């Protein structure tokens, strides 16, 4: 028992991180097979960033202007292209540490692990969620762009996020590995603001099931509710509307605990309306929404990876 915000083991991704330098700018790249992926903002100076014309900036860049460093070895760039907001730098050496991998575009509400890197070297790993407003609440400094987010299933790494930029309120925005931003954000230094930070209702419910599994039961009340009545109360609290699809996804946790999802919704409703009275649930004083139902099952059943 116990329950922690748990990241995936990062070894498979650590062997893919390199440093990419162009002009006066450095960030991280992802080296898979003979291609290095990195944010296209590596070609910008600080003044470029207010209003960059990336296609025009790229005209003055050749293969040899991209300095790619894996440890103390320089990779040889034999081609480059821009796809949306990422650059793909073809190198003449396949990464011998390339894992089995896929590129996926995740849905809001899904979670992943971030390997925060600087100068191609890892600083740490932590778990994040793609928020409903398409930001993530990460921990990133200057030089962290190009760090990636990922999931693992069995032996296959699904890359879903590459870091680009920081927004007001200290949250972060980036792209999938095809270079398309999550949400409406653009890689330029303009006034951009996250929308409403909506709470991922299905994840809070998953975490309440995790609490029950661990013996933290004080919040189970004597009530049930309906989907429509729950959403009426939760809309006021900026919770995502709960759908039947969400209820079905919670089926495994409901069957394990014997608690119908709508019963748990009634308990959540009272927590939203009356607060937690200074009590804690799984060591937390607020309702945690960055565990998916799959995250809970994984951690409570000991799912491992190869």
């Amino acid at each position: 028992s116990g329950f922690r915000k748990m990241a995936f083991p990062s070894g498979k991704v650590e062997g893919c991180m390199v440093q990419v330098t162009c002009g006066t700018t450095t960030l991280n790249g992802l080296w898979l097979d003979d291609v290095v992926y990195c944010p296209r903002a590596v070609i910008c100076t600080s003044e470029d960033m207010l209003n960059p014309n990336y296609e025009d900036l790229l005209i003055r860049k050749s293969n040899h202007n991209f300095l790619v460093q894996a440890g103390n070895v320089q990779l040889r760039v034999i081609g480059h292209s821009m796809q949306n907001c990422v650059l793909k730098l073809k190198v003449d050496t396949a990464n011998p540490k390339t894992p089995k991998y896929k590129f996926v575009r995740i849905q809001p509400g899904q979670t992943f692990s971030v390997l925060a890197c600087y100068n191609g070297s890892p600083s740490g790993v932590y778990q994040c969620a793609m928020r409903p407003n398409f930001t993530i609440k990460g921990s990133f400094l200057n030089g962290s762009a190009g760090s990636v987010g990922f999931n693992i299933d069995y032996d296959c790494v699904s890359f879903c996020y590459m870091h680009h930029m920081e927004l007001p309120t200290g949250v972060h925005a980036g792209t999938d590995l095809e270079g398309n931003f999550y949400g409406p954000f653009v890689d330029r230094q303009t006034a951009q603001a996250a929308g409403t930070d909506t709470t991922i209702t299905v994840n809070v419910l998953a975490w309440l099931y995790a609490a029950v599994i661990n013996g933290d039961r004080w919040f189970l009340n004597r009530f049930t509710t309906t989907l429509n009545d729950f959403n009426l109360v939760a809309m006021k609290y900026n919770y995502e509307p709960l759908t039947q699809d969400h209820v079905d996804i919670l089926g495994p946790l409901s069957a394990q605990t014997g608690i119908a999802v709508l019963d748990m919704c009634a308990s959540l409703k009272e927590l939203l309306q009356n607060g937690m009275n200074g009590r804690t649930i799984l060591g937390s004083a607020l309702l945690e929404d960055e565990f998916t139902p799959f995250d809970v099952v994984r951690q409570c059943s000991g799912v491992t990876f190869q």
Partner: peptide, 11 residues
Amino acid sequence: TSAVLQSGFRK
């Protein structure tokens, strides 16, 4: 706020 692209300066 403006968005800040979190590249780093070349050393």
